[PDB]
Design an enzyme around this catalytic site. Structure first.
Site, PDB file in Angstrom:
ATOM      1  N   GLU A   1       0.803  -1.227   0.000  1.00 16.77           N
ATOM      2  CA  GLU A   1       0.000   0.000   0.000  1.00 16.77           C
ATOM      3  C   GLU A   1       0.839   1.283   0.000  1.00 16.77           C
ATOM      4  O   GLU A   1       0.402   2.312  -0.521  1.00 16.77           O
ATOM      5  CB  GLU A   1      -0.986  -0.004   1.170  1.00 16.77           C
ATOM      6  N   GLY A   2       2.033   1.220   0.587  1.00 16.41           N
ATOM      7  CA  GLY A   2       2.972   2.343   0.572  1.00 16.41           C
ATOM      8  C   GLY A   2       2.664   3.467   1.546  1.00 16.41           C
ATOM      9  O   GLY A   2       3.052   4.615   1.314  1.00 16.41           O
ATOM     10  N   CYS A   3       1.979   3.134   2.640  1.00 15.56           N
ATOM     11  CA  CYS A   3       1.586   4.114   3.651  1.00 15.56           C
ATOM     12  C   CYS A   3       2.765   4.601   4.482  1.00 15.56           C
ATOM     13  O   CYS A   3       2.913   5.799   4.716  1.00 15.56           O
ATOM     14  CB  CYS A   3       0.523   3.526   4.589  1.00 15.56           C
TER      15      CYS A   3
ATOM     16  N   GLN B   1       8.313   3.198   1.224  1.00 11.39           N
ATOM     17  CA  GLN B   1       8.256   2.957  -0.209  1.00 11.39           C
ATOM     18  C   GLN B   1       8.968   1.645  -0.517  1.00 11.39           C
ATOM     19  O   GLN B   1      10.190   1.542  -0.381  1.00 11.39           O
ATOM     20  CB  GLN B   1       8.899   4.113  -0.974  1.00 11.39           C
TER      21      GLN B   1
ATOM     22  N   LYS C   1      13.188  -1.758   0.082  1.00 10.65           N
ATOM     23  CA  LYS C   1      12.532  -0.742   0.893  1.00 10.65           C
ATOM     24  C   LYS C   1      13.380   0.524   0.936  1.00 10.65           C
ATOM     25  O   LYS C   1      14.604   0.464   1.108  1.00 10.65           O
ATOM     26  CB  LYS C   1      12.236  -1.247   2.313  1.00 10.65           C
TER      27      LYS C   1
ATOM     28  N   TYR D   1      11.848 -11.269  -1.849  1.00 14.48           N
ATOM     29  CA  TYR D   1      10.585 -10.987  -2.514  1.00 14.48           C
ATOM     30  C   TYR D   1       9.627 -12.161  -2.341  1.00 14.48           C
ATOM     31  O   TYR D   1      10.026 -13.314  -2.478  1.00 14.48           O
ATOM     32  CB  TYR D   1      10.837 -10.713  -4.000  1.00 14.48           C
ATOM     33  N   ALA D   2       8.370 -11.853  -2.033  1.00 14.85           N
ATOM     34  CA  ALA D   2       7.320 -12.863  -1.908  1.00 14.85           C
ATOM     35  C   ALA D   2       6.178 -12.501  -2.851  1.00 14.85           C
ATOM     36  O   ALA D   2       5.466 -11.518  -2.628  1.00 14.85           O
ATOM     37  CB  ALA D   2       6.831 -12.957  -0.463  1.00 14.85           C
TER      38      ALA D   2
ATOM     39  N   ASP E   1       4.603  -6.982  16.330  1.00 18.31           N
ATOM     40  CA  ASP E   1       3.621  -6.580  15.312  1.00 18.31           C
ATOM     41  C   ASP E   1       3.199  -7.782  14.478  1.00 18.31           C
ATOM     42  O   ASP E   1       3.063  -7.696  13.257  1.00 18.31           O
ATOM     43  CB  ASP E   1       4.204  -5.471  14.419  1.00 18.31           C
TER      44      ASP E   1
ATOM     45  N   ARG F   1      -1.492  -9.394   8.027  1.00 14.05           N
ATOM     46  CA  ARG F   1      -0.995  -8.362   7.107  1.00 14.05           C
ATOM     47  C   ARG F   1       0.539  -8.290   7.069  1.00 14.05           C
ATOM     48  O   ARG F   1       1.109  -7.820   6.086  1.00 14.05           O
ATOM     49  CB  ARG F   1      -1.558  -6.981   7.484  1.00 14.05           C
ATOM     50  N   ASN F   2       1.192  -8.745   8.145  1.00 16.50           N
ATOM     51  CA  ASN F   2       2.656  -8.745   8.244  1.00 16.50           C
ATOM     52  C   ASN F   2       3.288 -10.114   8.000  1.00 16.50           C
ATOM     53  O   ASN F   2       4.462 -10.347   8.315  1.00 16.50           O
ATOM     54  CB  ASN F   2       3.104  -8.175   9.593  1.00 16.50           C
TER      55      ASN F   2
ATOM     56  N   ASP G   1       7.980  -7.368   8.081  1.00 12.83           N
ATOM     57  CA  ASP G   1       7.756  -6.122   8.825  1.00 12.83           C
ATOM     58  C   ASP G   1       8.379  -6.100  10.226  1.00 12.83           C
ATOM     59  O   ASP G   1       7.678  -6.213  11.237  1.00 12.83           O
ATOM     60  CB  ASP G   1       6.257  -5.785   8.881  1.00 12.83           C
TER      61      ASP G   1
HETATM   62  N1  3RH Z   1       5.063  -8.849  -2.098  1.00 16.90           N
HETATM   63  C1  3RH Z   1       6.028  -8.383  -1.271  1.00 16.90           C
HETATM   64  N2  3RH Z   1       7.231  -9.011  -1.232  1.00 16.90           N
HETATM   65  C2  3RH Z   1       8.205  -8.578  -0.424  1.00 16.90           C
HETATM   66  C3  3RH Z   1       7.968  -7.465   0.379  1.00 16.90           C
HETATM   67  C4  3RH Z   1       6.735  -6.821   0.333  1.00 16.90           C
HETATM   68  N3  3RH Z   1       5.775  -7.296  -0.496  1.00 16.90           N
HETATM   69  C5  3RH Z   1       6.504  -5.629   1.211  1.00 16.90           C
HETATM   70  C6  3RH Z   1       5.484  -4.714   0.925  1.00 16.90           C
HETATM   71  C7  3RH Z   1       5.276  -3.602   1.745  1.00 16.90           C
HETATM   72  C8  3RH Z   1       6.093  -3.412   2.861  1.00 16.90           C
HETATM   73  C9  3RH Z   1       7.114  -4.327   3.148  1.00 16.90           C
HETATM   74  C10 3RH Z   1       7.333  -5.437   2.320  1.00 16.90           C
HETATM   75  C11 3RH Z   1       8.411  -6.444   2.603  1.00 16.90           C
HETATM   76  C12 3RH Z   1       9.509  -6.001   3.504  1.00 16.90           C
HETATM   77  C13 3RH Z   1       9.740  -6.731   4.672  1.00 16.90           C
HETATM   78  C14 3RH Z   1      10.770  -6.354   5.531  1.00 16.90           C
HETATM   79  C15 3RH Z   1      11.574  -5.253   5.224  1.00 16.90           C
HETATM   80  C16 3RH Z   1      11.351  -4.523   4.055  1.00 16.90           C
HETATM   81  C17 3RH Z   1      10.321  -4.903   3.193  1.00 16.90           C
HETATM   82  C18 3RH Z   1       9.045  -6.945   1.303  1.00 16.90           C
END
Ligand code: 3RH
Length: 285
Positions: free
Chosen positions: A22-24, A27, A50, A99-100, A146, A150-151, A164
């Site tokens: 969502e980018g709240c 980024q 990130k 990446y997931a 946390d 969602r996390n 997270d």
């Molecule tokens: N589909 C997806 N894959 C990987 C991440 C996120 N979304 C994501 C999406 C939003 C926020 C965070 C994240 C994750 C994160 C975790 C821990 C540290 C930095 C990034 C990385």
């Protein structure tokens, strides 16, 4: 920022792509990282990066640094989003993580609700995987603080990964009994003592894991439905707990309820949860 050569990754080998999440609060983007797997120096790996938003504050930067540092101290585990590298010198801070592809668990489950669906075995397996990640986290002396659907992120091969680590701390790095402590934890996933006593232990995470379990077995349900945040803690002091989800056994619900024992030391440990879930999953499969 001080140099950490072990974790440093070349900016020229990283190609930033589409936004993720969502980018709240940060980024996060998809990216291709060439040679990030040191055994394959020429292979591009799809990663998540990130970084700060354009409207970032000073606190956002020091938080992102602290999150990276936290992830450095947590060793590799299959059920955890691991740090892969960072770009820290001569430019903007990028924190490069696994990446997931299937996004967060709440959305994942909500999308495969019946109007391929999750089986009971799928749900227990999901719970087991996260118990294992949390067992490992606790062994590394890390409190997550946390824990929520969602996390949790899920990969292409359906592996559950705890994500997270922005609120995560070393167990010894909690300012005990200070009125500000735990002020930034989502109230509906939070152990009562975290607010009432201003402490956070591994047993506090166990409570949250109970909530996460409920989320899982309600296929991404929202905890305490119809109860506003403002009235929750009065109800919890009075012993209110969430009812059993439909597609979940009495045994698994008793496990949730154990996680929500008022007395922290009367809750199971993550070790015990892993053992019990291992048994349940084995018999289910
Ligand atoms: N589909 C997806 N894959 C990987 C991440 C996120 N979304 C994501 C999406 C939003 C926020 C965070 C994240 C994750 C994160 C975790 C821990 C540290 C930095 C990034 C990385």
């Amino acid at each position: 920022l001080p140099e950490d050569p072990k974790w440093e990754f070349p900016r020229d080998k990283l190609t930033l792509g589409k936004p993720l999440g969502e980018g709240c609060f940060g980024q996060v983007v998809m990216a291709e990282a060439v040679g990030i797997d040191k055994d394959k120096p020429k292979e591009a790996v799809t990663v998540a990066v990130k970084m700060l938003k354009d409207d970032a504050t000073e606190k956002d930067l020091s938080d992102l640094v602290s999150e990276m540092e936290m992830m450095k101290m947590i060793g590799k585990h299959k059920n955890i989003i691991n740090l892969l590298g960072a770009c820290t010198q001569d430019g903007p801070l990028y924190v490069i993580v696994e990446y997931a592809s299937k996004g967060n668990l709440r959305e994942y489950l909500r999308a495969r609700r019946p109007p391929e669906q999750m089986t009971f075995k799928d749900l227990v397996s999901c719970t087991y995987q996260l118990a294992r990640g949390m067992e490992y986290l606790a062994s590394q002396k890390c409190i997550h603080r946390d824990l929520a659907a969602r996390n949790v992120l899920v990969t292409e091969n359906n592996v559950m990964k705890i994500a997270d680590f922005g609120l995560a701390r070393d167990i010894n790095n909690i300012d005990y009994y200070k009125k500000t402590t735990n002020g930034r934890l989502p109230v509906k996933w939070m152990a009562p003592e975290a607010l009432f006593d201003r402490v956070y232990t591994h047993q506090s995470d166990v409570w949250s894991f109970g909530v996460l379990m409920w989320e899982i077995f309600t296929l991404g349900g929202s905890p305490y439905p119809g109860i506003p945040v403002e009235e929750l803690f009065k109800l919890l002091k009075e012993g209110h707990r969430m009812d059993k989800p439909a597609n979940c056994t009495n045994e698994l619900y008793m496990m949730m309820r154990d996680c929500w024992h008022a007395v922290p030391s009367q809750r199971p440990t993550f070790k015990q949860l892993v053992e019990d879930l291992d048994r349940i999953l084995t018999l289910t499969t």
